[PDB]
Design goal:
Chain A: Belongs to the eukaryotic ATPase subunit F6 family. This is part of a larger assembly, with chains A (66 residues) and B (58 residues). Chain A is mainly α. Chain A is built from 2 helices and no strands. Helix content of chain B is 97%, strand content 0%. The chains are: A mainly alpha (66), B mainly alpha (58).
Chain lengths: 66, 58
């Protein structure tokens, strides 16, 4: 064959179309969402429920000595 | 006669030697004891500062 780049055009088109109509799962419809929501929770479990928009800081003390 | 002179000889020098050796030891050993304790203290804390840096950076 011969069309190399004319095929790539055909693929290209839809990439922009979706981006310029963003909303939900993008023409996917709810179906992408239903998985996503679980996945995002699961990843929280790997780091525990520590907030990620906070900065942590604490003090630290002393024990018995000699 | 000669027996008592050598016998007394051991016993009188003994009580000295031992006590001058005891005296010399306690000076350096007691200063060492103090020293070692300071040692052990300092360590722990730089550790405590060090550990916090690793922990929070993680």
């Amino acid at each position: 064959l011969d069309p190399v780049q004319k095929l790539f055009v055909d693929k290209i088109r839809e990439y922009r179309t979706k981006r310029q109509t963003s909303g939900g799962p993008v023409d996917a419809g709810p179906e992408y969402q239903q998985d996503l929501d679980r996945e995002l929770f699961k990843l929280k479990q790997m780091y525990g429920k520590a907030d990620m928009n906070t900065f942590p800081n604490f003090t630290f003390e002393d024990p018995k000595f000699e | 006669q000669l027996e008592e002179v050598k016998q007394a000889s051991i016993k009188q020098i003994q009580d000295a030697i031992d006590m001058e050796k005891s005296q010399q030891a306690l000076v350096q050993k007691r200063h060492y004891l103090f020293d070692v304790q300071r040692n052990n203290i300092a360590m722990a804390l730089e550790v405590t500062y060090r550990e916090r840096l690793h922990r929070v950076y993680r």
